[PDB]
Design a protein around this ligand. Structure first.
Ligand code: 1FY
Ligand code: GLC
Length: 418
């Protein structure tokens, strides 16, 4: 690395977060999860800790057979699943490519094509009498119900989807049975984990555990993060659709990460430390610096070409120094996102530890998967904040994890009386 520009470093250093800071954030998250878990304070609690009814014991034994529907980009998978016995997950499936016609009509006309494919599948395997439960993997539930009803020839119960943190936990559990935490760092950020039943005051029972959906994005309503906010965070918060809300997520989520960078670049520019104090009209446009650009700038192999090309797309003609500064502005934001995020997962893992540590954590999300070194910085920060825990991280990815998600969602549904 070259000797950095001092003036720039003083501005980017404002993003730094010390251990003592993250422990502050951690402890504040912890008290907020306590408020969420308890009957008495749950309604005013901003971190809701939603019981998911996904228990540590297999329930809904009378659901052995079901249909799993993995809805993807340009196609979908229909999959028949039979659960037996550890659970014996038997599957057969079919890939269906969505025609361009079906893609480009309306959402209702789309799900009629999906329903049509389901009919063919059931005919192919002689199951059009069986009235199977159907889960979704990746209001489409509503659309499929209406599209099946519209057909009338076969009957089918489309169950409620699980939260994406829960699906991540369940599909990662398939491959590593030590997984008891699900986490998403994409557009938004959330976490779920297996809580002790005695702590889940909203569902009575002492025995076993239940997944709890933290919905921790809402953390910060009472100013729990105020001392750690910066002018740019405040600006993002004011221009957003929901000012004063989702403050924790605003620091971390992919939804705003690009906008934060853009604002940092404008500060630098206005300080005459970047682009000779001259921004483009694109750069002065809200939303122009896409979050994908951040990962791209931080992927640059050292030759400045991915950075140059991105900045050129915004109507800038950057010097080599300008490209270095952008990289460092991107890293500041990323690394701060990773810190803030690690403080949340640390509060969860330390809370789980008190009740008892080798533990696996399932993770998903574009930021965690695709941002060059978010995961690395994130891992190291959590491990630091969680002494006496050994944390294995895995990413969700033959379609049997998805089948296990759909089995749980259907069995949950049976258990709750539909
Ligand atoms: C027999 S098994 O080894 O295949 N197996 C997987 C399923 N589960 C949990 C879900 C898991 C989800 C991940 C964390 C631990 C519970 C489970 O099925 N929970 C349910 N809650 C409501 C309906 S079903 C089990 O208890 C054990
Ligand atoms: O998609 C990740 C997360 O984004 C948002 O925070 C949603 O509120 C939450 O339900 C979801 O788990």
């Amino acid at each position: 690395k070259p000797m950095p520009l001092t003036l720039v470093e003083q501005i980017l250093a404002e993003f730094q977060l010390q251990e003592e800071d993250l422990k502050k954030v951690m402890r504040r998250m912890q008290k907020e999860m306590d408020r969420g878990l308890r009957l008495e304070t749950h309604e005013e609690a901003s971190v809701k800790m939603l019981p998911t009814y996904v228990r540590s014991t297999p329930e809904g034994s009378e659901v052995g057979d079901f249909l799993s529907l993995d809805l993807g980009g340009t196609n979908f998978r229909v999959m028949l699943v039979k659960v037996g016995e550890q659970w014996s997950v038997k599957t057969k499936h079919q890939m269906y490519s969505i025609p361009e016609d079906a893609m480009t009509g309306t959402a209702e006309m789309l799900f009629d094509y999906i329903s049509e494919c389901i009919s063919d599948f059931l005919d192919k395997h002689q199951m059009k009498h069986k009235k199977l439960p159907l889960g979704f993997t990746f209001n489409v539930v509503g659309l499929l119900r209406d599209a099946i009803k519209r057909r009338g020839d076969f009957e089918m119960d489309v169950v409620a989807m699980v939260n994406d943190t829960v699906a991540t936990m369940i599909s990662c559990y398939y491959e590593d049975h030590q997984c008891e935490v699900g986490m998403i760092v994409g557009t938004g950020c959330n976490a779920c984990y297996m809580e002790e039943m005695q702590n889940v005051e909203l569902v009575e029972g002492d025995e076993g555990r239940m997944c709890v959906n933290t919905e921790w994005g809402a953390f910060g309503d009472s100013g729990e993060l105020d001392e750690f906010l910066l002018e740019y965070d405040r600006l993002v918060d004011e221009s957003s659709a929901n000012p004063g809300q989702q403050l924790y997520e605003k620091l971390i989520g992919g939804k705003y990460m690009g906008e934060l960078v853009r604002l940092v670049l404008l500060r630098l520019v206005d300080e005459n430390l970047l682009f000779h104090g001259e921004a483009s009209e694109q750069l002065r446009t809200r939303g122009a610096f896409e979050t994908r650009f951040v990962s791209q700038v931080e992927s640059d192999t050292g030759d400045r070409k991915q950075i140059y090309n991105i900045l050129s797309t915004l109507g800038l003609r950057p010097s080599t120094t300008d490209c270095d500064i952008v990289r460092r502005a991107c890293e500041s934001v990323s690394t701060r996102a990773a810190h803030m995020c690690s403080a949340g997962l640390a509060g969860v893992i330390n809370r789980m530890r008190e009740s008892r540590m080798r533990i696996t954590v399932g993770v998903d999300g574009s930021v965690y998967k695709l941002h060059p070194s978010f995961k690395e910085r994130f891992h190291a920060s959590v491990r630091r904040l969680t002494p006496s825990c050994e944390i294995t991280f895995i990413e969700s990815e033959s379609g049997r994890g998805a089948a296990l998600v759909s089995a749980v969602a259907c069995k949950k549904a049976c258990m709750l009386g539909q």
